[PDB]
Protein: Calcium-transporting ATPase type 2C member 1
Amino acid sequence: MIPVLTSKKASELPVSEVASILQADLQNGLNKCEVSHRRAFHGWNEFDLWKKYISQFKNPLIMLLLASAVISVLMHQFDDAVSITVAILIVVTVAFVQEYRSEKSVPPECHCVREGKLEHTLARDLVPGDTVCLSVGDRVPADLRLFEAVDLSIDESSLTGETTPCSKVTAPQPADLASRSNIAFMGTLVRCGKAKGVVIGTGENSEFGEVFKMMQAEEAPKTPLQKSMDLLGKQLSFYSFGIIGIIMLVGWLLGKDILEMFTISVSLAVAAIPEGLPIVVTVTLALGVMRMVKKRAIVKKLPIVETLGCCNVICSDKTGTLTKNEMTVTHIFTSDGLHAEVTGVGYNQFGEVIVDGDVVHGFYNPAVSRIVEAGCVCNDAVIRNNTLMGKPTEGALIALAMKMGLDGLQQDYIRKAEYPFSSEQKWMAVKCVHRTQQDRPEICFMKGAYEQVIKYCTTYQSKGQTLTLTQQQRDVYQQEKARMGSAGLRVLALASGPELGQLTFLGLVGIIDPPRTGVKEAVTTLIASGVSIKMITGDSQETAVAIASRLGLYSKTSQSVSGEEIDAMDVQQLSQIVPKVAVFYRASPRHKMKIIKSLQKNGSVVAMTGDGVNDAVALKAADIGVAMGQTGTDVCKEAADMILVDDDFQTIMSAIEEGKGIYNNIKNFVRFQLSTSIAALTLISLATLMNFPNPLNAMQILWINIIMDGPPAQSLGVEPVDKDVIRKPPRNWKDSILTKNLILKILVSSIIIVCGTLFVFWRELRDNVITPRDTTMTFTCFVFFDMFNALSSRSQTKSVFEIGLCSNRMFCYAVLGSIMGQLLVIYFPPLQKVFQTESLSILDLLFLLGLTSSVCIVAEIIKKVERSREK
Ligand code: BEF
Ligand SMILES: [Mg+2]
Structure:
């Protein structure tokens, strides 16, 4: 049996040994029967509801409602039983919708050596021991041990975050993911020419497979909003059970009938549970998701919308999220001395070259145009549809030529002698003849490292004429090279001439992987907002520090910690060091997970914005998983909870503001609904205690909570948010929703509603027996109390006149609909039969409005008193 070798094991053993265990053929390939057998055993080269709905019934509130329903059906109360059943079904469905995570969001074509080469093959068809070829712009299909690689470099930015392509060698290594120069791992593009290797791993055994297993092992933390709502539900369950028990035992001591106490406990348990709260919360979160979808962000779970409003730390993958991952020629330094700055980011025509504050196009400036032409002519990389097929620096030079408008200069020259780029050579030289005139002499264009180019150059150009090189000019060029190096740029020396050793030094170009457009401004805004932004990447110290300094995360006195130090550091000292530092470099996926888990240990709500495979574990471990919509890999977008469609960081600020507004609205309607529930519970308890018959039954309580107080609460959940709410710093997730002031307001509203409703109920009670007039008076009084409480519950600080009655059109429509429904209940004969109510005179309605305005008046009085006291 032919086992799969671990990448480290394959790198350690020589080529012959690897082929011996893998039982491979270096030249001929694999027999069809052997491929079929290994595919049958190992499998293809790929990797990857009812119980969720049932689990909602485990909630204690749902259990209490089921107990109420079964007690109701034991007696002959069919209406209460069916109403409570419908309420339970609706609550369970909306809870399942809230907890449901959406998963709605060609195989790599690899030419392996199957039978005499030239086999088109597919990514899936590979089996261990297969020999697969590689070329430029070809993604690596599976982890292959490179047994033949001539001038090979591979871009592992997605896999490991290393910007520079990794040079690949065939000889076994004496001994890290990057240190294994022999192996070429799955999912990494090949920049350089050619390679061939034996497929050591297929499926779960690839590096993608190891990171996927790490991701699956991890469990995503629960959102702060979900924790707060679970705590609130536990508090409500304890309160309801305690109140029901105390009332039951007290009344039994008083001597009330057992059947009467059961038929009253049904109403008590229905009232004490706010049924509309989960529905309203789910609807609010769904509207937030829709708004984010409008704002170029796809949220995969409803509670995630509020989560970015509570985040304290935002982490970031440097390569591909903060930086475009596309090299750009930022700076040009002419040999004469002219300084030019180049805008634009990536491989595209957008942007322009600015010289001394003046935009230069075409051949306006002969020196910079000549430098651009020299860079563009001696290139192999070609850009199609803003995608690069070739070296990154050559693509950057092509993009610069595109910006200058000289992209049609590669066609004017045809190569005669080409000198390939080599690791020891460090310079590329090409001779061309101008197409229009063959009589023109041979002209050689060369580029590469400054040292070699200036060694092969003996003259330099200035003001349209050639001058002999001197020591002073070489010193100036060296100083400019040092200045560019200190700024994080990569320096290439461009030169042209008639033959090697007689070139005219043209200038220098500074190439850097630049931050994405608008990332700097968004980072500054987020830092000013109170969020501490950290950078976690697997790249080198120099590149990470340069990018961090450009974005502003890094200062002279700031500190940076490698991944190896993190591994060596103990849990405690890691917990003290991680908050201090802001840049982490050479961080493996396990190290990124360690960093985020140590941040979460201190209590911070961590959000990471990565795009690579190495960020999948970190994204799942993070409280918010943000991924780039376009550049993000399949695994990273699988581990994310929100994806930025346009790869814009302003979407992060929009999400933060939306989360803050959603939480504020949630607080408002939670206050309203708990006030209503406590008022109903207290009214029923007081009526039962003093021998009054129960004023409200299960059907009426459910009607009030859902039909009448539903639309007003789903209008309070969409109330426009004040600027001061979203301008506040991120809150502490340990804080509860029910503040002391909120509880005070809820108790005041409950007391007033109880007093008014009990007064009406007792006044209309003729001979301690409920008459339909009493039923309709109590029902309408409670509904009007609820409408006025909803009106006064729009904001905790701003008075309604300050806000405006007609500011929220949805609220006005919901209130009008509720009033029309109540009028139908008290006037429509079928509804009168259903609810055992009666028609009411206009004077009674006026009296009810006057009595029910007291809760609003007291609420605004308390608001004014609080405002005066705050000053
Ligand atoms: F892509 Be990141 F730099 F890990
Ligand atoms: Mg990345």
In short: The domain at 232-292+656-870 is CATH 1.20.1110.10 (Calcium-transporting ATPase, transmembrane domain). Residues 650-689 form the longest helix (40 residues).
